[PDB]
């Protein structure tokens, strides 16, 4: 039903260490998302609704589809080659804001309030369980694919073998 992405990010405030961003949504990012930041000790979580996303796009005067695309690149680690996003977090105000940096100019792409979680260990455990479940699934997919490749390669060798044989029978 629901989907998520966990990404490493660097905060301008705290550049020495890696933080993680966990973003989860229902069907598409457009209908709202839950966003969690953690440093492995504490965690801060907020929610952004569909209407809040649509309002942010309109406030900035960016087309709605483009804005949602920008959130994907910035928040889901989907950035291409020529897109740079910077991330900021105030632990005082619990304000998270990020910018898109172009060659000569940057602009604020979004900003939400992420409140400090009372059970960070619980959030971290659940995050790690998700990673481990994902890995078991991917390992199964790899196994299935390695079997498909083995079978296809066999089918091809045998067909090359029949081609050699046909050539022999054509000569005799």
């Amino acid at each position: 039903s629901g989907e998520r992405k966990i990404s490493r990010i660097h905060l301008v405030s705290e550049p020495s260490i890696t933080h993680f961003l966990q973003v989860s949504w229902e069907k598409t990012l457009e209908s709202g998302f839950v966003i969690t930041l953690t440093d492995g000790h504490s965690a801060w979580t907020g929610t952004v609704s569909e209407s809040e996303i649509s309002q942010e796009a309109d406030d900035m005067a960016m087309e709605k589809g483009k804005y949602v695309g920008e959130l994907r690149k910035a928040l889901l680690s989907g950035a291409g080659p020529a897109d740079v996003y910077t991330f900021n977090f105030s632990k005082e105000s619990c304000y998270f804001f990020f910018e898109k940096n172009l060659k000569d100019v940057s602009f604020r792409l979004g900003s939400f309030n992420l409140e400090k979680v009372e059970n960070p260990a619980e959030v971290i455990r659940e995050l790690i369980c998700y990673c481990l479940d994902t890995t078991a699934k991917n390992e199964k997919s790899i196994d299935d694919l390695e079997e498909k490749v083995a079978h296809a390669k066999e089918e091809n060798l045998n067909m090359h073998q029949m081609l050699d044989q046909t050539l022999l029978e054509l000569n005799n």
């Binding site: 029949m162 081609l163 046909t166 029978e169 054509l170």
Partner: protein
Amino acid sequence: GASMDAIKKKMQMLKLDKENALDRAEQAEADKDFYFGKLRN
């Protein structure tokens, strides 16, 4: 597969076609020489 079988068969037939054409050729040539010897004498 079946394609290979169909190809072999057709190639076998084309070898036969060639053989039958050469047989025809040898016969017509023998008749030519016969009419040539008969025409000359």
